[PDB]
């Protein structure tokens, strides 16, 4: 799982944009790999983090955490660089046991991946419509 330039192709409403998160590094204090889209302003960039927690003595459960942050520009008609106004967050935490299995791990991965595309979650996040 070595870090490197991640290029998400088609994403968005109409599915036309693409994202290029460049490789920042890994905070070692918490074992967190990070990726950012190309820019200059730390406060104005789409960011993603991946972390892999092994079964601690007080946990005994494997954890994978993946976060995504996207800030709004709301650039003003002058008067300085833009200002962060809104911040979209997404967080996923997958969890297994020590005798976990590759296959059902990938199974859960793909299950959630296709759920994210199914029309239910579409209008559940898209239009904020309660599942109903």
């Amino acid at each position: 799982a070595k870090l490197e330039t991640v290029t998400l192709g088609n994403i968005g409403k109409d599915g036309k944009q693409t994202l290029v998160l460049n490789p920042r590094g890994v905070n070692p204090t918490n074992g967190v790999a990070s990726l950012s889209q190309a820019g200059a302003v730390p406060a104005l960039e789409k960011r993603v983090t991946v972390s892999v927690s092994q079964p601690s003595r007080n946990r005994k459960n494997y954890k994978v955490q993946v976060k995504i942050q996207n800030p709004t520009a709301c650039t003003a008609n002058g008067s300085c660089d833009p200002s962060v106004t809104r911040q979209a967050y997404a967080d996923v935490t997958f969890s297994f046991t020590q005798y976990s299995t590759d296959e059902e791990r990938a199974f859960v991965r793909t299950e959630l991946a296709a759920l994210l595309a199914s029309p239910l979650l579409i209008d559940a996040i898209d239009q904020l419509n309660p599942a109903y």
Binding site: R57, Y99, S100
Partner: protein, 419 residues
């Protein structure tokens, strides 16, 4: 590919050490120049020279790649790593300040930097005949040197088992339910005919009515942990012997045939060998992902003496049974430290290290004066894993089977405790 080079997966997808790569790695040749340039600054024969020419012509050293291990035992012992660095020719920088005032208008004074020289490396040598003897006597005196501590440990662990048995008796009395019969152990500490005063209660006459028992348990289990520490430190025997070997470097000309540099280089080569011991079953596949810490060992001992504990008023039974179960768990974990203990690892190392040197300049009537300091760049270091031990070993399985028996019995005793 997923794991680093010196690691591999097991049956249930568990981190394990890849022996085939640890003990039989893939050597590779490298010729990475470190300081292929030298600088002379000063004046020689009324000529200020400050060029920067190369010195390194050709490099070749065999060595092994980078590897990672993981402890294969509860005590945290790591396996040894096969490493090689056998340069075809040694390397030593010389930051000397050559200078000499000769007659008839001949003076020189300058400083050299980043100037190295290659010389022969005596790789062919073996001190096995001198190292092998220095194991038999050590083993023979071992039991005479630590039998005392081993015996006191054996008695301490049995005393721990006895304490736990008495505690189990008290708990079973609690579970069955009785106030007067519960004092079977209470009479085993006061050293006196204690009489009652009123109507007591089960949990009241067990939560701290056994303070002497709790203190004894804490003390002697800390005792056992301390002796345990030393004892597992005692499962390793490393010995080495060192000798000196002076060498000569060929002639060299930092300048353009302006002055000769000669002398001597003092190094020592030491041959070392280290034998280890651990389990002979689970050493290859040791679950590093599921083990308890070492602090809970103190935690459980201090729990009953802690005067801060709310579970005594919610679920005494659960907390006490968990105490039992975790004690048994730690006991079983440490048990593997004494099952089928034999030769499991063995490394032999040969290393060269400089100590001193000498320099002598000779071109016309010994005109040069040298006052430099020597430093090496490349040193021969070869550490290889070996399994063939051509000599009587100290098989420490028979002398530890008793401890294994004791721990297994105590684990059976504690797991026999039910809610």
């Amino acid at each position: 590919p997923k794991l680093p080079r010196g690691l591999r997966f097991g049956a249930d997808n568990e981190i394990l050490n890849d022996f085939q790569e640890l003990w039989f790695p893939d050597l590779f040749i490298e010729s990475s120049d470190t300081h292929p340039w030298y600088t002379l600054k000063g004046r020689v024969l009324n000529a200020h020279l400050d060029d920067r020419l190369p010195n390194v012509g050709g490099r070749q050293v065999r060595r092994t790649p980078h590897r990672v291990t993981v402890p294969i035992a509860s005590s945290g012992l790591r396996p040894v790593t096969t490493v090689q660095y056998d340069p075809a020719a040694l390397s030593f920088l010389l930051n000397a300040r050559v200078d000499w005032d000769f007659g008839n208008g001949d003076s020189a004074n300058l400083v050299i930097n980043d100037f190295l020289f290659r010389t022969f490396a005596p790789k062919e040598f073996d001190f096995s005949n001198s190292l092998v003897p220095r194991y038999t006597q050590a083993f023979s005196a071992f039991n005479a040197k630590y039998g005392t501590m081993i015996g006191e440990g054996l008695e301490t662990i049995k005393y721990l088992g006895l304490l736990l048995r008495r505690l189990r008796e008290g708990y079973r009395a609690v579970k069955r339910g009785d106030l007067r019969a519960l004092r079977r152990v209470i009479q085993s500490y006061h050293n006196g005919k204690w009489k009652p005063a009123t109507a007591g209660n089960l949990w009241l006459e067990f939560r701290y009515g056994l303070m002497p028992l709790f203190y004894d348990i804490r003390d002697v289990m800390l005792d056992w942990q301390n002796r345990h520490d030393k004892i597992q430190r005692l499962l390793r025997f490393s010995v080495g012997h060192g000798e000196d070997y002076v060498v000569e470097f060929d002639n060299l000309y930092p300048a353009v045939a302006y002055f000769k540099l000669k002398g001597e280089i003092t190094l020592e080569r030491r041959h070392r060998h280290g034998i280890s011991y651990a389990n002979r079953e689970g050493y290859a596949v040791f679950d590093n992902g599921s083990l308890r810490p070492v602090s809970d060992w103190k935690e459980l001992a201090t729990a009953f003496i802690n005067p801060h504990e709310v579970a005594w008023e919610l679920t005494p039974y659960s907390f006490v049974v968990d105490w039992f179960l975790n004690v048994g768990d730690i006991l079983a974990q440490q048990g593997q430290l004494y099952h089928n203990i034999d030769i499991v690892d063995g490394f032999d190392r040969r290393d060269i290290r400089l100590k001193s040197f000498t320099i002598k300049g000779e071109r016309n009537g010994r005109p040069v004066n040298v006052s430099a300091s020597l430093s090496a760049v490349d040193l021969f270091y070869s550490r290889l894993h070996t399994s063939n031990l051509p000599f009587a070993t100290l098989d420490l399985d028979t002398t530890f089977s008793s401890f294994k028996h004791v721990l297994d019995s105590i684990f059976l005793l504690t797991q026999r405790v039910k809610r």
